[PDB]
């Protein structure tokens, strides 16, 4: 939202040219991935009576 333009020419005493500059910043979320190896297994559930 904040916009402000800066002048870049001393004057029209040399070339008759008008120049104006602006500065911007860009925020980017670069992704990095770590390779994995997949294996399968099993989980079993049992119920027991103590002693």
């Amino acid at each position: 939202k904040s916009i402000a333009f800066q002048d870049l020419t001393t004057g029209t005493a040399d070339n008759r040219l008008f120049a104006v500059g602006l500065n911007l910043t860009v925020v980017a979320e670069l992704p990095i991935l770590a390779y994995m190896q997949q294996t399968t297994g099993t989980i079993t559930v049992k119920a027991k009576i103590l002693e």
Binding site: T40, G41, I43, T44, V45, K46, A47, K48, I49, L50
Partner: protein, 104 residues
């Protein structure tokens, strides 16, 4: 002779099994899914509730067995096979009583 011919002993375990089934069905919709870490917290909560209701009691002999009413443990052999087991000490019933009169 398995302490099973008493009516309530199968009833407690059947109720706990039904509760576990309902918990596991809901857990399957979680992002990770069924996990050994996830299956311990819920079981601890339900077993604590059952202890609070009075269904599970401490072992009769504190020397031989620990004071805890239930033991929940997870064991791992290799990486493919996991195992989750819980043991319980059911409440007893009072059905046979004997009196012995004496004379001073």
């Amino acid at each position: 002779d398995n302490y099973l011919h008493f009516q309530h002993v199968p009833s407690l375990m059947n109720a706990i099994s039904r509760f576990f089934v309902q918990l596991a069905r809901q857990m399957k919709h979680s992002p990770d899914g069924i996990t050994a870490a996830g299956l311990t917290k819920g079981m601890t909560k339900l077993l604590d509730r059952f202890v609070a209701s009075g269904a599970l009691v401490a072992p009769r002999d504190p020397d031989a067995d620990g004071t805890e009413p239930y033991v929940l443990k997870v064991t791992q052999a290799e990486f493919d096979k996991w195992e989750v087991v819980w043991a319980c000490c059911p409440t007893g019933v009072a059905r046979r009583i004997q009196g012995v009169p004496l004379l001073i």
